[PDB]
Design a protein around this ligand. Structure first.
Ligand SMILES: [Cl-]
Ligand SMILES: [Cl-]
Ligand SMILES: [Cl-]
Ligand SMILES: [Cl-]
Length: 124
């Protein structure tokens, strides 16, 4: 099985581009990261920063997660992110995504040793 930290990396990291290329960024990335394999993941955010900077958020501002857990952290600085969400025309096996690029703080849940990101909670 995939570890929690590795699943977070695969689903949420894109350190190779500074920001979403075109409107087709999400269709390509959701496919590349295997998030459209058996079904279309409905919503998924990619962060365009180094893995180190995203991991460093786990020692930044401790805040509540939406589900009430207390292991969430909000990055002190804004980061380049792209939110990918299915459009109305999306239907497996023909997934289709809207690409929205933004610069916002990220909120992640962290766990383990090393204490690293295991869930992407929200962007602010
Ligand atoms: Cl790992
Ligand atoms: Cl590259
Ligand atoms: Cl997400
Ligand atoms: Cl941006």
């Amino acid at each position: 099985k995939e570890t929690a930290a590795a699943k977070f990396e695969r689903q949420h990291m894109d350190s190779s581009t500074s920001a979403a290329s075109s409107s087709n960024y999400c269709n390509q990335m959701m496919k590349s990261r295997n998030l459209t394999k058996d079904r279309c993941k409905p919503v998924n955010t990619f962060v365009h920063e180094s893995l180190a900077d995203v991991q460093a958020a786990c020692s930044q501002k401790n805040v509540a997660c939406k589900n009430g857990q207390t292991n969430c952290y909000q990055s002190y600085s804004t980061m380049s992110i792209t939110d990918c969400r299915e459009t109305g025309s999306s239907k497996y096996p023909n997934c289709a995504y809207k690409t929205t690029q933004a610069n916002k703080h990220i909120i992640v849940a962290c766990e383990g040793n090393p204490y690293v990101p295991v869930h992407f909670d929200a962007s602010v």
